[PDB]
Amino acid sequence: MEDVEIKPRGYQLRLVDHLTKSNGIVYLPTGSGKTFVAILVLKRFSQDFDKPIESGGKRALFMCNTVELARQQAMAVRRCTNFKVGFYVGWTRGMWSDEIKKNQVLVGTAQALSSLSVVIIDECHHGPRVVGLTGTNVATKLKELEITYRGNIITVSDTKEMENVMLYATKPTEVMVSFPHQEQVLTVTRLISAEIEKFYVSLIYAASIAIISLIVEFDIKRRQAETLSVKLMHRTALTLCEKIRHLLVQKLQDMTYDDDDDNVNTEEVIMCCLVFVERRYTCKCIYGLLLNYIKWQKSAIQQFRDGNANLMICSSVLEEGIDVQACNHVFILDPFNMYVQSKGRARTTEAKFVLFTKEREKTIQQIYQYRKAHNDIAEYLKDRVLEKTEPELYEIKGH
RNA sequence: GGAGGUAGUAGGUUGUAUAGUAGU
RNA sequence: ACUACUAUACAACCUAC
């Protein structure tokens, strides 16, 4: 219930007040101080169940599939607290030992294990005091209750006392409907399809992955050729051929890599913010053409979160546990399901958001925008006391 | 590395429901 | 009413991407 650096918000302090001596999942939106409220309850954790006693202690652990989030939460969040912090990624017996009491709070990947009374599970909804982390109506309520039963969860932290601090810190993303009519160019359609048909008919796991990567790149460049003729067509073809040729040196792959580069370039010769797409070649072509015409992971992240990069391309695995500073908006090309998943990474200062693309319109309105019925299902599960949760977990423990 | 999980699509099988046709 | 075939929808399992 304490504060690491910034003053704790009223919504984050009320949600972590009942989690001191209790155990349960805590869900907070980006920009609302999620990780800030995590160190809050963690400060009162080791200061109660562990301290004053030196012998008995609780080592906070973090289980996440992303290796970049291990040192992340262990520096701007865990290290800011008065308690010790540490990061271990790919022995762990020295940091988890209660005798030395060195680096209590830890973070890493791939998870005596019962010696720690405080345990945290990051992204546990996709599957001692256990604390979880998360972002039809009968199917959603049954899945959330089953995860909270075996996952050792009772009280769910949410906005109750003050609901104004929720939308104030995290601004709602504006939904902008954009339906471009450019998809597949009918003019000279057999010329662009000749290279994709010749590459697919030229074909174990290495040969199939190279053919699937060229087919996915040609399909992404086909829709990008309608918007920009020679911009994204020559950029995606040259980057895909150079990456396959520089990955390995072989006489069999040299004929397919050299021929795909010369044929695609000759046929296509005729003429801060966040982004998510399946192919990174289309995002690099749009950012490269806009900035020209009027070991690498450390240098790229240094120029991204600092504000020097106006465009950032992420992936499906990189869409969670991210931090963006001065984000103008978030766009998606070809990637309430993905809505809150992509926007849940980081918070943007501007509430306006656009999506690059007959389609959607009333069709996407019924499928998406499920937060209306999801609000009643999430509120009913978070308001359940420990009486109904105990009987559900005890009866299902035999399975 | 390795690997599992998640999500979508396609195919096959099984169960249920509905509609149509045929037989008793 | 029962049986068989076909089509659609839902659920489960397996395989592939």
UniProtKB/Swiss-Prot annotation:
<comment type="function">
    <text>Double-stranded RNA (dsRNA) endoribonuclease which cleaves endogenous (endo), exogenous (exo), and viral dsRNAs to produce short interfering RNAs (siRNAs). The generated siRNAs then mediate gene silencing, also called RNA interference (RNAi), by controlling the elimination of endogenous transcripts from mobile and repetitive DNA elements of the genome as well as exogenous RNA of viral origin. Also acts in an RNAi-independent manner to activate translation through cytoplasmic polyadenylation.</text>
</comment>
<feature type="binding site">
    <location>
        <begin position="28"/>
        <end position="35"/>
    </location>
    <ligand>
        <name>ATP</name>
    </ligand>
</feature>
<feature type="region of interest" description="Essential for binding and cleaving blunt termini (BLT) dsRNA substrates. No effect on binding or cleaving 3' overhanging (3'ovr) termini substrates">
    <location>
        <begin position="1"/>
        <end position="399"/>
    </location>
</feature>
<comment type="similarity">
    <text>Belongs to the helicase family. Dicer subfamily.</text>
</comment>
<feature type="region of interest" description="Helicase insertion domain; involved in homodimerization">
    <location>
        <begin position="184"/>
        <end position="258"/>
    </location>
</feature>
<feature type="domain" description="Helicase C-terminal">
    <location>
        <begin position="272"/>
        <end position="385"/>
    </location>
</feature>
<feature type="domain" description="Helicase ATP-binding">
    <location>
        <begin position="15"/>
        <end position="147"/>
    </location>
</feature>
<feature type="region of interest" description="Sufficient for interaction with loqs isoform PD (loqs-PD)">
    <location>
        <begin position="348"/>
        <end position="358"/>
    </location>
</feature>
<feature type="short sequence motif" description="DEAH box">
    <location>
        <begin position="122"/>
        <end position="125"/>
    </location>
</feature>
<comment type="subunit">
    <text>Component of the siRNA-directed RISC loading complex (siRLC), composed of at least Dcr-2, r2d2 and Taf11, which processes dsRNAs into duplex siRNAs which they then load onto AGO2 to initiate formation of the RNA-induced silencing complex (siRISC). The Dcr-2-r2d2 complex exists as a heterodimer and heterotetramer, with the latter showing higher siRNA binding activity. Interacts (via N-terminus) with the siRISC loading cofactor r2d2; interaction is essential for formation of the siRLC and consequently, formation of the siRISC. Interacts with Taf11.</text>
</comment>
<feature type="region of interest" description="Helicase domain; essential for RNAi silencing activity and binding to r2d2">
    <location>
        <begin position="1"/>
        <end position="389"/>
    </location>
</feature>
<protein>
    <recommendedName>
        <fullName>Endoribonuclease Dcr-2</fullName>
    </recommendedName>
</protein>
